[PDB]
Design a protein around this nucleic acid. Structure first.
Lengths: 141, 57, 221, 185
RNA sequence: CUUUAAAUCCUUUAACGAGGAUCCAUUGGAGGGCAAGUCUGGUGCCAGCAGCCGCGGUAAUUCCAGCUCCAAUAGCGUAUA
């Protein structure tokens, strides 16, 4: 610090509050605008329904068309794109299915070579993709 | 080929091999002890070039 | 293979008239032969390669690379050391780093923490070292708490003998060479600190040069 | 409003470093030459040693000739005397910092029974405690993590219904005898 | 038999009660951090792996399958504050 005395508290309190308010992560984590812009609203998981299946292209260095699912939410109705975790599981998902959408790991940020899409699918038709991938259960039609 | 937007190709065409038998373990009591006596007691890593326990030379 | 002394220090220590390197550290004599330390110390000396760093030049015809090595030396009871070498062949760099680590060898005088019993196990004071952006600090520790640090101070201090020390670093500690040289400078400044037990006025013993000049002048000119 | 406890505390702590060869090899040697089951026992003993060392550091950071420092001083000293880790030669406050993992792992019931010569192997000693054979002070103990105190060290013996030290034979001998008598006639 | 308003839970004693003790121990990984195979077959910038760097173009120590290995072991992995 700079100011050093006995009765020096107000100026340093104002300095601490202003320089903490000028931080970026603290401003993101303590204002209602970022919580309003978040479709989940601080929720770990949020179920939705499927209206279309559009696969997005890859990025500049690598070229592999990775398939994705557009899911409309129920609590908000916003159209957010999800991403299938494993290989060949797009046959496990159909139109107007009961999917469960969660985050991917970067606190709501784009990850890797997939542009724009930030979410994924962990459960479809009230069963996980792991059981369908390992063939432990069967999706009921 | 032909239809590019088709998923599950690498598992759609592959080879399927069944499983095999399974022995008895020590539930980690002497399993890591066998790890110790087959990793450091018998063989040692060379100073400069390492040698793992699964290095099938 | 066979040792032939060329300097005066090697000839005097092979003449069997110097007991330890303690009086060499009193007189601060420079060491120019690596095998003198082999004459003093026994089989308690081992080596440990740190990391091979692939630095490179660049010329008209592509880029040309050579290997940069590090090694840590020092027995458990007493002295430490460090050596940096960079050459084309990795093996010659290893032997050169071993030789240069045998050249630069310094001791550390361990102290106690609070009460005093048995043998010293920690640093006598809070000493720091810096050769760049690294601000490394040594802290005295109680008996048997174990060193805690980055694990390359852990291997350096287990090569040293100080089993109880807290550390604190600051800066870009990703670079291994600068950080290792900084903690070497921090551990080498142990004797360069005035202590309350050492305020007795020092005596000046007779130098081995002062007694054996007449022997060396007839041994080698 | 219920008559409940809600008093729960942890016993093992996980290290900050996830994977490193030195401490893993050290605790592997401790399990191999002490016959533990997993890392939970050695982590629990390390946590108890850390608590004792923290209490010792809190005692030594106080000033001399203080009644509280003396109070938990001879309290902790007499407790480590009664467990059977220290001895009658070194009962000073500066000898508590020189304790190792071996000093607290030696007082386990499994290691004590293995060192008593009443069993064959370390794992055999652990299962022999686990099979409810060996009692202390006319009371059987099936738990291998029993800290043996110094005074109760000559009171380790087989129970009355343990077949190895006198008693009724178990299922195997009577089944073998019944099968032999059935096959004889 | 005991506890219990009466039961059930624990302990005790009877009679049964395992030889591949099928009375079968699961979860993520194996290029670096990050402990752990340049093992063997398949498509070969397609399908995928990957929190970061990147790996995939016709012999992949990273993809998909079998053995071996490596971490905690009735526990382990993912997301969110």
């Amino acid at each position: 610090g700079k100011c050093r005395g006995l009765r020096t508290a107000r100026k340093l309190r104002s300095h601490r509050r202003d320089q903490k308010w000028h931080d970026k992560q603290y401003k993101k984590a303590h204002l209602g605008t970022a919580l309003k812009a978040n479709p989940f609203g601080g929720a770990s998981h949020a179920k939705g329904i499927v209206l279309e299946k559009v696969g997005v292209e890859a990025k500049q260095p690598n070229s592999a068309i990775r398939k994705c699912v557009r899911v409309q939410l129920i609590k908000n109705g916003k159209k957010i794109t999800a991403f299938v975790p494993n290989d060949g599981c797009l046959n496990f998902i159909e139109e107007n299915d009961e999917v469960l959408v969660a985050g991917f790991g970067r606190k709501g940020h784009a990850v890797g070579d997939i542009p724009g899409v930030r979410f994924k699918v962990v459960k479809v038709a009230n069963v996980s993709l792991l059981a369908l991938y390992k063939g432990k259960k069967e999706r009921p039609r | 080929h032909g239809s590019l937007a088709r998923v599950g190709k690498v598992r759609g065409q592959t080879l399927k091999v069944a499983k095999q038998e399974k022995k008895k373990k020590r539930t980690g009591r002497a399993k890591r002890r066998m790890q110790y006596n087959r990793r450091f007691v018998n063989v040692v890593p060379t100073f400069g070039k390492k040698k793992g326990p699964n290095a099938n030379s | 293979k066979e040792w032939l002394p060329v300097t005066k220090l090697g000839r005097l220590v092979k003449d069997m008239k110097i007991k330890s390197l303690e009086e060499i550290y009193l007189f601060s004599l420079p060491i120019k032969e690596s095998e003198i330390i082999d004459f003093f110390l026994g089989a308690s000396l081992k080596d440990e390669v740190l990391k091979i760093m692939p630095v490179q030049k660049q010329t008209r015809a592509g880029q040309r690379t050579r290997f940069k090595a590090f090694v840590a030396i020092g027995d458990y009871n007493g002295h430490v050391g460090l050596g940096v070498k960079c050459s084309k062949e990795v093996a010659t760099a290893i032997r050169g780093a071993i030789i240069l680590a045998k050249l630069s060898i310094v001791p550390v005088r361990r102290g106690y923490w609070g009460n005093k019993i048995g043998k010293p196990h920690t640093v006598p004071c809070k000493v720091t070292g810096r050769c760049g952006s690294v601000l490394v600090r040594l802290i005295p520790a109680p008996r048997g708490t174990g060193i805690v640090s980055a694990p390359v101070p852990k291997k350096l201090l287990m090569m040293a003998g100080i089993d109880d020390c807290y550390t604190s670093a600051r800066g870009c500690t990703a670079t291994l060479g600068n950080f290792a040289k900084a903690t070497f400078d921090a551990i080498s400044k142990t004797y360069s600190y005035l202590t309350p037990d050492l305020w007795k006025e020092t005596v000046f013993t007779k130098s081995p040069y002062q007694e054996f000049t007449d022997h060396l002048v007839k041994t080698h000119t | 409003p219920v008559a409940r406890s809600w008093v729960c505390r942890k016993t093992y702590v996980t290290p900050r470093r996830p994977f490193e060869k030195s401490r893993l090899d050290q605790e592997l040697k401790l399990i191999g030459e002490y016959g533990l089951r997993n890392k939970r026992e050695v982590w629990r003993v390390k946590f108890t040693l850390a608590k004792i060392r923290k209490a010792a550091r809190e005692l030594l950071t106080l000033d001399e000739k203080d009644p509280r420092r003396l109070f938990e001083g001879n309290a902790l000293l007499r407790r480590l005397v009664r467990i059977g880790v220290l001895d009658e030669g070194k009962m000073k406050l500066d000898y508590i910092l020189g304790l190792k993992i071996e000093d607290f792992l030696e007082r386990r019931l499994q290691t004590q029974v293995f060192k008593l010569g009443l069993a064959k192997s370390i794992h055999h000693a652990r299962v022999l405690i686990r099979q409810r054979h060996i009692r202390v002070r006319k009371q059987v103990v099936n738990i291998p993590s029993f800290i043996v105190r110094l005074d109760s060290q000559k009171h380790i013996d087989f129970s009355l219904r343990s077949p190895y030290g006198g008693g009724r034979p178990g299922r195997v001998k009577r089944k073998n005898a019944k099968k032999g008598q059935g096959g004889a006639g």
